[PDB]
């Protein structure tokens with residue numbers, strides 16, 4: 001029922017984040033804690049957790065040894081993306097907005 | 105080659121005040137990457153303005169906020185090798201001032217001395233700051249000394265300036281190890297006259 005609809009949209013967000021950023025949420029405690037009925041649609045919380053766990057700004061020097069999985073995305077979409085200042089954290093938030101909206 | 109990171113008018117910014125972080129180099133970098141390391145790390149991709157044989161880019165903070173304070177560093181890139189970024193610039197700490205009690209700056213033996221006289225500026229406060237910063241107007245290198253004695257219920261850091269050679273207006277700040285980008289209200293400027 002609605003419980004099934006909730007899990008369907010949560011999995012869509014999880015799959016969306018993983019395929020768009022080229023990362024895996026397996027073992028990622030901060031992100032998995034937010035995959036709930038209320039916290040799975042808050043783009044601000046998810047964007048903040050991706051930055052906290054995957055440390056995208058650390059990809060400037062190759063990444064934090066703890067998780068350099070987001071670096072291919074960071075390089076393609078920010079550091080070597082092909083005027084005004086562009087914030088890395090803004091780009092991440094804007095990407096999460098599209099994943100959440102195109103999830104259904 | 106290592107770019108240069110500057111703050112205009114300076115790295116010591118007041119809350120809600122404006123500051124411009126300038127990234128520049130003699131090497132023609134098409135893009136500049138400004139990294140902030142602090143409570144909320146972020147990287148900004150600035151477009152390089154090639155002019156006068158120097159490439160430069162500005163990052164303007166219209167209203168200074170706590171989340172924007174931190175250690176900034178500039179990296180340079182060229183569309184030729186977009187994956188090979190330059191060595192970072194020397195770190196620039198953007199500090200928010202005016203958050204704690206204004207310390208008191210006094211001169212010993214006095215604020216007006218004959219050349220060759222040993223002067224020692226004394227920074228004091230009721231608050232137990234972990235560090236005191238003595239700034240000479242014009243100079244960028246601030247002097248940090250923890251507190252030595254305790255006088256009249258106030259902790260004090262005494263900065264010996266050695267024999268007098270030239271004058272200057274000095275200011276004083278206090279900081280805490282746990283809040284590194286938040287400093288005290290500036291002390292009232294003390295004019296030393298040799």
Ligand SMILES: *[C@@H]1O[C@H](CO)[C@@H](O)[C@H](O)[C@H]1NC(C)=O
Pocket residue numbers: 038039042044045
């Ligand atoms: C959604 O995120 C915002 C910003 O953090 C905040 O209102 C709160 O964390 C969340 N609101 C909810 C779940 O109602």
Ligand SMILES: *[C@@H]1O[C@H](CO)[C@@H](O)[C@H](O)[C@H]1NC(C)=O
Pocket residue numbers: 220221222266267
């Ligand atoms: C000033 O201090 C120096 C270094 O301690 C020492 O020679 C002496 O105390 C003073 N010398 C003067 C007044 O020239």
